[PDB]
Design a protein around this nucleic acid. Structure first.
Lengths: 143, 142, 154, 157, 141, 58, 60, 88
RNA sequence: AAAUAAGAAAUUA
C-alpha cells in the first residue's frame, strides 16, 4: 500500500514531553484533522468550575477583604471604555453571570475580513492573502 | 515537458501557453528565418547596415584541426560557391549541405537558406497518437 | 464622414441601455440638439429623452420602492407599462437621430459608412472600398473606384 | 563525479557557480569588446589626426583583433540563464517567475516567504503597494525614478 | 508533472530525404526569388490608379477646375514620372505648395491596397486577382 | 452687505471679522492665473535645482 | 511636462525610434557593467552562502 | 452647486483650485468634477461657518470612497475580467 | 467574462 512511516521524536532541551505528545503523532491517518484546545491556570478555573473549599487564615482574610464582586465586575466591564482597552464581550459576560447568579456570494471566503476580534491571530503559513483586521483598503478623507 | 526531444525535456516545464516579455522567449527558434521577400531581400534577417563587416564566423580565428559544420549566421560568399569545398550547417535531423552552389545565395546568411520547418514529416518519429493529430490538421494523408 | 468601414448594427434597446455612458452622454445629446435646431425643427423627442434620462441618472444609486404582494399584479403591470412607454419614447428618438443624420448627410455630399442607406441617393446600402469585393447584401460586384453619389463640383 | 559522494542534494546547483564566472568574464571583456565595436562601426572620421585611409585601415585592424580573441565574452545579459542559488530552479527574468532583488525563482520566493526566512511585508495582492512612486506610474515610473537618482541628479564634469 | 516519455528514433534514410528536400526547396526558392524580383520591379516601373479619394475635397471638384487645373498645368509631368505611386504622388503634392497644409488634413487618399491597383482597374475584384506565387508583399501586380 | 458681514446665525450676533469688506481685488494678486510657458519653465527649474545649495554660508 | 503624472523634470528617454545598443554613439555614452549590481550578484549570490565569507575547511 | 446650496452669489468670491493628485492633461470628466465640487464646498464652510448646515444636508461635504480595482495580472484586462475556462 | 468609480432593478431556502 506504500504505507507512510514516521519516526518518533524524543524529548529535547526545547521540545518537552507534553509538547511532543500534543503537537506530534506517529500515526499518519490522524494528520490534518483539526485544532485541539486546552486550558491553563485561569481559563481552567473558569471552565472546571472548582468551588473553593474554605481554608485557613488566607481564605478568611479573603472572605473579609472581598468587597462587592457584583460591583467590581461592573467596573471592569466599564473600564473597557478607557483609552488603552477595548470593550469586551467576555468582561460583559462575567458581569452578566454575577448579576443573574440567582459579499454574500463570498462570505465563506471573507470569514476573516471584517473588524474581527481574534483569539489566535492568523499567520502566514495558514493565511495566504489576508492583511489583518485593522486594515482599511478604501479610506475616506477625514479632517 | 510531455515528450523529451533532448535532455531538457526532463528539466523544463511548459507552463501551458505562457506569455513572455516582447522579443525574449527563452529559446531562440527561428522559424521565420527563411521567409521570402523580394523587396526586403537585403534588409530582412540580415545586417542592419551594408557597411558592417561579416561576422566572426566567416573567418578562421585560431589554429584549427577542422570543423564539422560551420555556424548558421555565417554569410554565403562567392568563394562558398566557387571553391567547391564542403559547406555544412547544423539543421535537424542532422546536417544540411550546400552541394549545389548558386550565386543567388551570395550575401545572405545560411539561416536564410535553410528551411527550419520542412513541409516534409517523418512518420517514424511520430507516435500513432501524434500521427492522428497530424491527420486532423490535414498534413499527413489518411 | 471619416468613418467609412462596414459596421455591426446593435438592436435599439441595447443602445438605449447604455444610459449615461453613450445614449444619454450629455456631450452627444447636445450635438444632436444642434443638428435639429440648425434645421429649424423643434427637438421634442430629444427633450423627452433628456428628461427621462436626466432623472434616471439622478436616482440611479437608490433602492426601488418596497413592494407589497398582490394577487392582482396591478403594481407590477403598471410599472411595466410605464417602463415600455419610456422605452418607446426613446425608440422614437433613436429613429429620429438616424433619420435626420442620414438626410443631412445627403445634403452635405457626405458618404456614409459602408452598407448604409441615404434615402434619395443610395437606396440599397452605399458601399465603396470594402474589405470584401462585392456589395455584402446585394451580392453584386463593386466597381473601382468607389461609387459616387454626388455630381462633381464642390 | 559520476555521482560518487556528491555533497549537495541537487547537482545542478553547480551551474549557478558557472554562471557567476560568466559575469566575471564579462567584467573582464566588456570595455574591450565595446571599444572594438565602436571603433569598428564608425563611419564619420575618427578624429582630426586619424582620417581617410589610415582610419579605414585601423578599423579593419581592430575588428581583426577583436575576432582573434578566443573566449572573449560577448553574450548579451538577457540571454544568460537565471538559476536559483538554493534549489536551482530557473525562471525567465522580467516574468513573474523570477524575483529580482533576492534573485531567486518564484518557487523559492514562495517557500522562503511563507516559512519565515526572508523578511518582507505583506501588502494587498491587488494594488500597486505602499510605495509612492509605484503608486503613481507603475513599474515604468519607478524604473525611471531609479534612473533619476543614479544618474541625473549629478551634473557631470 | 509526469516523467517525459522518450522520443522515438529519427528514421532510416530520413537524413537523405531531409537533405534532398531542403536542397531543392532552396533551388526552387531561387526561381521564386528571381520571379518576385522581376514582379516587384515591373510594378515599380508600371503605372497605377490615382491615389486620391475623389469622394472628398479638394478632389471631387470637376476635372476642369481647382486641384485638377493645378495638376494639368503645373504638376503633370512629375505625376507621370512617378507613375502615380501613392507615396511620391503625395510628396509631390506637398512640394507643389499651392495646396499647402491640406494634403494630409482635408484631403482623403485611398487605402493602401486599393491605391496599389494597376491603372485601368475597373472592378474591385482586381485586388484578389494578382499573382500569389510571388513574394512581393502586395507590391506586385 | 458683503457676504461676510451678513449675520447668519438666527440665535446669535457675532463680531464682524476684521477682513470683511477690506481686502481688495487685484487679478495680479489673486485668484492665481498664469501663462503655461512660464509654468513649465518654473516647474522644470525647480526640479533641476534641488542640489544647488551652498550649505556653508557666512 | 508637469501636465502628466509622470513628470520627472528630466528627459528620461530620448525619442528616437531606431536607437540601439548596436550604435557607436550609444556605446560612447554607456555605463559599463564593472562594479554595478552585476558584480555584486556575481560575488554574493552563490550556492552555499557561507562559502562567500570563508573557506569551509579553514573555518571547520 | 455649493454657492447655490449656501444661498450665495458666486460672484462675491474668488477661487483658485490646485491639483495635488495624479496630473493629467485633461481633468474634464465627472469624477474629477465631483472632487472639485467637494474642495470648493469645504473651503466655503471654513469661510462662512454657518453655511455648513445646508451644505452638509445636501451631501456636498460627504466623501464617497470608491476606487478602480487595483491592477492584477490574473485578470485579462488587468482589472475585472477572469481568463477563459474550458471543461477539462 | 462581469453587479468592486461607476451608471443594469423585481419570480429565496
Amino acid at each position: 500500500a506504500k504505507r507512510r512511516v514516521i519516526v518518533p521524536i524524543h524529548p529535547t532541551p526545547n521540545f518537552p514531553a507534553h509538547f511532543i505528545k500534543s503537537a506530534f503523532t506517529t500515526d499518519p491517518l490522524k494528520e490534518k484533522q483539526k485544532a485541539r484546545f486546552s486550558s491553563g491556570g485561569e481559563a481552567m478555573r473558569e471552565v472546571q468550575d472548582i468551588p473553593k473549599n474554605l481554608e485557613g487564615e488566607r481564605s478568611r482574610r479573603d472572605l473579609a477583604s472581598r468587597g462587592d464582586t457584583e460591583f467590581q465586575a461592573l467596573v471592569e466591564f466599564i473600564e473597557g471604555a478607557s483609552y488603552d482597552q477595548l470593550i469586551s464581550g467576555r468582561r460583559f459576560k462575567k458581569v452578566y453571570d454575577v448579576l443573574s447568579e440567582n459579499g454574500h456570494v463570498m462570505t465563506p471566503h471573507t470569514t476573516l475580513h471584517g473588524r474581527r476580534i481574534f483569539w489566535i491571530p492568523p499567520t502566514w503559513n495558514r493565511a495566504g492573502r489576508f492583511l489583518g483586521p485593522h486594515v482599511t483598503l478604501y479610506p475616506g478623507m477625514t479632517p | 515537458l510531455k515528450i523529451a526531444k533532448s535532455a531538457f525535456g526532463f528539466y523544463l516545464a511548459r507552463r501551458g501557453q505562457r506569455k513572455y516579455p516582447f522579443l525574449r522567449r527563452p529559446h531562440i527558434k527561428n522559424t521565420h528565418s527563411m521567409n521570402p521577400s523580394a523587396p526586403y531581400f537585403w534588409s530582412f534577417m540580415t545586417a542592419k547596415s551594408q557597411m558592417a563587416f561579416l561576422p566572426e564566423e566567416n573567418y578562421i580565428t585560431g589554429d584549427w584541426t577542422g570543423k564539422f559544420f560551420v555556424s548558421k549566421r555565417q554569410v554565403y560568399t562567392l568563394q562558398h560557391a566557387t571553391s567547391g569545398a564542403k559547406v555544412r550547417v547544423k539543421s535537424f535531423p542532422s546536417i544540411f549541405e550546400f552541394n549545389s552552389p548558386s550565386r543567388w545565395n551570395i550575401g545572405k546568411e545560411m539561416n536564410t537558406l535553410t528551411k527550419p520547418r520542412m513541409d516534409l514529416i517523418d512518420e517514424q518519429m511520430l507516435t500513432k497518437k501524434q500521427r492522428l493529430d497530424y491527420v486532423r490538421a490535414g498534413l499527413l494523408p489518411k | 464622414n471619416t468613418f467609412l468601414t462596414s459596421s455591426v448594427a446593435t438592436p435599439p434597446i441595447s443602445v438605449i441601455r447604455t444610459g449615461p455612458k453613450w445614449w444619454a452622454d450629455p456631450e452627444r445629446m447636445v450635438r444632436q440638439k444642434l443638428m435639429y435646431f440648425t434645421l429649424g425643427v423643434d427637438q421634442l423627442p430629444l427633450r423627452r429623452t433628456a428628461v427621462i434620462q436626466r432623472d434616471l441618472q439622478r436616482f440611479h444609486m437608490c433602492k426601488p420602492p418596497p413592494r407589497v404582494g398582490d394577487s392582482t399584479g396591478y403594481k407590477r403591470s403598471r410599472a411595466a407599462q410605464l417602463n415600455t412607454w419610456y422605452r418607446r419614447i426613446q425608440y422614437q428618438e433613436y429613429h429620429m437621430q438616424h433619420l435626420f443624420t442620414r438626410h443631412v448627410w445627403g445634403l452635405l455630399r457626405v458618404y456614409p459608412g459602408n452598407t448604409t442607406k441615404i434615402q434619395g441617393k443610395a437606396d440599397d446600402g452605399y458601399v465603396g472600398y470594402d474589405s470584401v469585393p462585392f456589395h455584402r447584401y446585394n451580392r453584386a460586384p463593386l466597381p473601382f473606384p468607389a461609387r459616387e453619389l454626388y455630381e462633381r463640383r464642390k | 563525479m559520476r555521482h560518487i559522494g556528491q555533497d549537495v542534494p541537487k547537482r545542478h546547483t553547480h551551474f549557478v557557480l558557472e554562471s557567476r564566472l560568466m559575469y566575471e568574464k564579462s567584467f573582464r571583456d566588456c570595455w574591450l569588446h565595446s571599444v572594438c565595436r565602436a571603433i569598428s562601426q564608425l563611419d564619420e572620421p575618427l578624429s582630426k589626426t586619424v582620417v581617410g585611409t589610415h582610419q579605414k585601415m585601423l578599423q579593419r585592424k581592430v575588428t581583426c583583433f577583436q575576432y582573434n580573441q578566443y573566449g572573449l565574452f560577448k553574450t548579451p545579459y538577457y540571454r544568460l540563464a537565471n538559476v536559483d542559488r538554493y534549489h536551482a530552479v530557473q525562471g525567465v527574468a522580467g516574468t513573474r517567475e523570477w524575483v529580482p532583488y533576492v534573485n531567486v525563482s518564484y518557487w523559492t520566493m514562495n517557500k522562503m516567504v511563507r516559512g519565515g526566512n526572508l523578511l518582507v511585508h505583506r501588502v494587498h495582492y491587488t494594488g500597486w503597494g505602499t510605495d509612492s512612486h509605484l503608486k503613481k506610474g507603475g513599474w515604468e515610473h519607478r524604473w525611471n525614478k531609479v534612473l533619476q537618482r543614479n544618474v541625473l541628479q549629478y551634473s557631470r564634469i | 508533472w509526469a516523467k517525459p516519455k522518450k522520443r522515438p528514433k529519427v528514421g532510416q534514410g530520413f537524413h537523405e530525404k531531409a537533405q534532398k528536400w531542403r536542397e531543392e526547396y532552396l533551388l526552387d526558392r531561387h526561381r521564386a526569388l528571381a520571379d518576385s524580383l522581376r514582379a516587384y520591379v515591373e510594378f515599380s516601373t508600371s503605372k497605377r490608379v490615382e491615389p486620391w479619394d475623389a469622394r472628398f475635397k479638394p478632389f471631387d471638384r470637376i476635372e476642369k477646375d481647382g486641384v485638377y487645373v493645378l495638376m494639368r498645368y503645373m504638376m503633370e509631368e512629375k505625376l507621370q514620372l512617378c507613375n502615380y505611386h501613392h507615396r511620391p504622388v503625395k510628396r509631390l503634392f506637398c512640394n507643389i505648395g499651392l495646396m499647402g497644409p491640406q494634403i494630409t488634413t482635408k484631403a482623403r487618399w485611398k487605402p493602401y491596397r486599393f491605391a496599389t491597383n494597376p491603372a485601368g482597374t475597373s472592378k474591385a475584384e482586381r485586388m484578389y486577382q494578382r499573382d500569389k506565387t510571388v513574394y512581393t508583399h502586395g507590391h506586385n501586380d | 452687505l458683503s457676504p461676510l458681514e451678513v449675520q447668519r446665525d438666527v440665535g446669535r450676533l457675532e463680531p464682524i471679522p476684521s477682513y470683511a469688506g477690506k481686502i481688495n481685488a487685484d487679478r495680479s494678486v489673486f485668484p492665481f492665473q498664469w501663462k503655461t510657458e512660464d509654468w513649465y519653465e518654473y516647474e522644470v527649474a525647480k526640479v533641476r535645482n534641488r542640489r544647488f545649495v551652498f550649505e556653508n554660508t557666512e | 511636462s508637469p501636465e502628466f503624472k509622470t513628470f520627472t523634470g528630466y528627459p528620461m528617454r530620448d525619442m528616437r525610434p531606431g536607437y540601439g545598443q548596436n550604435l557607436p554613439d550609444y556605446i560612447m555614452k554607456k555605463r559599463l557593467p564593472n562594479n554595478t549590481h552585476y558584480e555584486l550578484f556575481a560575488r554574493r549570490d552563490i550556492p552555499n552562502e557561507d562559502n562567500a565569507m570563508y573557506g569551509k575547511y579553514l573555518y571547520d | 452647486m455649493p454657492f447655490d446650496e449656501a444661498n450665495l452669489d458666486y460672484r462675491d468670491f474668488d477661487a483658485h483650485i490646485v491639483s495635488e493628485g495624479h496630473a493629467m492633461p485633461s481633468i474634464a470628466n465627472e469624477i474629477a468634477a465631483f472632487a472639485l465640487r467637494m474642495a470648493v464646498a469645504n473651503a466655503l464652510v471654513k469661510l462662512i461657518p454657518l453655511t455648513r448646515i445646508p451644505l452638509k444636508k445636501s451631501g456636498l461635504l460627504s466623501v464617497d470612497r470608491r476606487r478602480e480595482r487595483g491592477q492584477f495580472p490574473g485578470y485579462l484586462d488587468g482589472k475585472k475580467v477572469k481568463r477563459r475556462f474550458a471543461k477539462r
